[PDB]
From Swiss-Prot, chain A:
The gene is ATPC. InterPro entries: ATP_synth_F1_ATPase_gsu (IPR035968), ATP_synth_F1_gsu (IPR000131), ATP_synth_F1_gsu_CS (IPR023632). GO terms for cellular component: chloroplast thylakoid membrane; proton-transporting ATP synthase complex. The lineage of its organism: Eukaryota, Viridiplantae, Streptophyta, Embryophyta, Tracheophyta. It is a peripheral membrane protein. HAMAP family: ATP_synth_gamma_bact. It comes from Spinacia oleracea (Spinach). Alkylation of Cys-88 results in the inactivation of ATP synthesis. This is ATP synthase gamma chain, chloroplastic.
Curated annotation (Swiss-Prot), chain B:
This is ATP synthase subunit beta, chloroplastic. It is found in: Plastid, Chloroplast thylakoid membrane. One of its GO terms (biological process) is proton motive force-driven mitochondrial ATP synthesis. Disulfide bonds: none annotated. It comes from the Eukaryota. The chain holds residues 250 to 494 of 498 of the full protein.
Length: 321, 245
């Protein structure tokens, strides 16, 4: 019947308006997230400056930090920053399938696959992959704060402070594009002796000049550039003195730097979820207006059909009256 | 068509031969009878069709009875107009035919030559007792694979498959592979396209269905199965594709 056709047409219109709304809405979410990940650039910046500073002054063959103590290859743990809301593209499923690949990798190295977990969807994917060691599942941390960062940071610090987890790794889709993000596992533990963090793929990300998601529109589609500005690479002063210790301050900054990379990683996974959700809703809006045109095409086709039935009713009258 | 049927009846009764009997277009025959009754001074019953259309097409199908002297393998065609199955021509035909291959327009927009919606066609011959239980079993498997694929298309359309499940994606690529392997070239079909078709036998088809729905072919590529006749021919085509790097 015609009105049901008109009805589902309007339904498609409602969902199309909603689809554009969802794309722009999570775009706004990701915009505040871009603000968010940039809002810590001074912290990690001066951190890395002091890091290269005291790594120059570190200069030793005898001192050590506990995170810097690479331990025996007995159990690697897997850190999984994730997304929270379902169908946010498939950054959830792509990073989780890559996480299953990591389960295979730590089953190939025999390194007793503990799994740190973030995100309620990540918590559910861990909860639905019941054949693994779920280390400490962190919740879906909506615009994650340094509090939850401190908590799961402390989880990392305690467990990797033990040899129990030796040399853990952190899976997150770094927000490269609003369209692409395959998962990347940065080498989370043991902490970097150069300070330049590595991938669990093995790629030593630079200590000084590193990538960070920002967003800019090259043409009418707003876009995502993982831009890289290098921080100040001065050391601390020659007039500056180490008031407590060189070695203990290294051991302390390890918690700080681990926290900094961890907060950035959770920000990376959250922004990736925001972007992929936005992209899915945008593509959905495109498909929506497409299906709308197809539906309205058949609708006016049926309008002609109803007119034709009227013409038939007219035609019988021509022999009738 | 009546004269064609009459000489065919000489073949099926006089000669008592097996009547290979192809004919097209019966919907055009209906359209001719429609405009003929429009000339005749009789009230055109359906959208354009004559009232006479019913018993006429019945008389058409009724001479087309497979006689005992010569059974009448009568392949006919309906110019299924306007893509209206509920056009009373195709509706009226859908009874009287024994096995109507429903040819899609859409699978040729997918490029399948032949473009039959095998979902939409139906056989009196479709039975485990008739086709073999293996045949109708794998057939129902592939059929419901198609049905699930078509149901999956709804959520696939707007949202896309990233919201779908992994068993959903498993079935989706599986029946996608089924649809692609359903595409095979046809023998004389080259004059448009260029491909020399494979006269694809039923059992090699059965093994290909077995590999596809059984997910043996789930490492072979969907595009490699496109217009690929045998599952071995699909395997060689996939070997070409996997060679292509």
């Amino acid at each position: 019947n015609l009105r049901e056709l008109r009805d589902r047409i309007g339904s498609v219109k409602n969902t199309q308006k909603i689809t554009e709304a969802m794309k722009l809405v999570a775009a706004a979410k990701v915009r505040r997230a871009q603000e968010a990940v940039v809002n810590g650039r001074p912290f990690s910046e001066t951190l890395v400056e002091v890091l290269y500073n005291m790594n120059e002054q570190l200069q030793t063959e005898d001192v050590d930090v506990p995170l810097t103590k690479i331990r025996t290859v007995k159990k690697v743990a897997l850190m999984v920053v994730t997304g929270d809301r379902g169908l946010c593209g498939g950054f959830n499923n792509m990073l989780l399938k890559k996480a299953e690949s990591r389960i295979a990798e730590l089953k190939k190295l025999g390194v007793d696959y503990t799994i740190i977990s973030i995100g309620k969807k990540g918590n559910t994917y861990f909860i639905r992959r019941p054949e693994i060691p779920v280390d400490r599942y962190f919740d879906g941390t909506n615009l994650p704060t340094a509090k939850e960062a401190q908590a799961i940071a402390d989880d990392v610090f305690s467990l990797f402070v033990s040899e129990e987890v030796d040399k853990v790794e952190m899976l997150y889709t770094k927000f490269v594009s609003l369209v692409k993000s395959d998962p990347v596992i940065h080498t989370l533990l043991p902490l970097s002796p150069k300070g330049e963090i590595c991938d669990i793929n093995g790629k030593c990300v630079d200590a000084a000049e590193d990538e960070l998601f920002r967003l800019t529109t090259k043409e009418g589609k707003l876009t995502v550039e993982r831009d890289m500005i290098k921080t100040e690479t001065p050391a601390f002063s020659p007039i500056l003195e180490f008031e407590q210790d060189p070695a203990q301050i290294l051991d302390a900054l390890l918690p700080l730097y681990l926290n900094s990379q961890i907060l950035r990683a959770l920000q990376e996974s959250l922004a990736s979820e925001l972007a992929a959700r936005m992209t899915a809703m945008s593509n959905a809006t495109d498909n929506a207006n497409e299906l709308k045109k197809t539906l309205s095409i058949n609708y006016n086709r049926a309008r002609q059909a109803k007119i034709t039935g009227e013409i038939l009713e007219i035609v019988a009258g021509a022999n009738a009256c | 068509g009546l004269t064609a049927l009459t000489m065919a009846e000489y073949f099926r009764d006089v000669n008592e031969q097996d009547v290979l009997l192809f004919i097209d277009n019966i919907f055009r025959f209906v359209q001719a009878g429609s405009e003929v009754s429009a000339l005749l001074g009789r009230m055109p019953s359906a959208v354009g069709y004559q009232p006479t259309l019913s018993t006429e097409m019945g008389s058409l199908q009724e001479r087309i009875t497979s006689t005992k002297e010569g059974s009448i393998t009568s392949i006919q065609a309906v110019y299924v107009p306007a893509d209206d199955l509920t056009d009373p021509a195709p509706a009226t035909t859908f009874a009287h035919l024994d096995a109507t291959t429903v040819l899609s327009r859409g699978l040729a927009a997918k490029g399948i030559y032949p473009a039959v919606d095998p979902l939409d066609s139906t056989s009196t011959m479709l039975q485990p007792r008739i086709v073999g239980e293996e045949h109708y079993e794998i057939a129902q498997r592939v059929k419901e694979t198609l049905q699930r694929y078509k149901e999956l298309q709804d959520i696939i359309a707007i949202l896309g498959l990233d919201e779908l499940s992994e068993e959903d994606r498993l079935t989706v690529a599986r029946a996608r592979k089924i649809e692609r392997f359903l595409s095979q070239p046809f023998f004389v079909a080259e004059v448009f396209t260029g491909s020399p078709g494979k006269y694809v036998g039923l059992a090699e088809t059965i093994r290909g269905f077995q590999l596809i729905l059984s997910g043996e072919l789930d490492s072979l590529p969907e595009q490699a199965f496109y217009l690929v006749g045998n599952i071995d021919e699909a395997t060689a085509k996939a070997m070409n594709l996997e060679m292509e790097s």
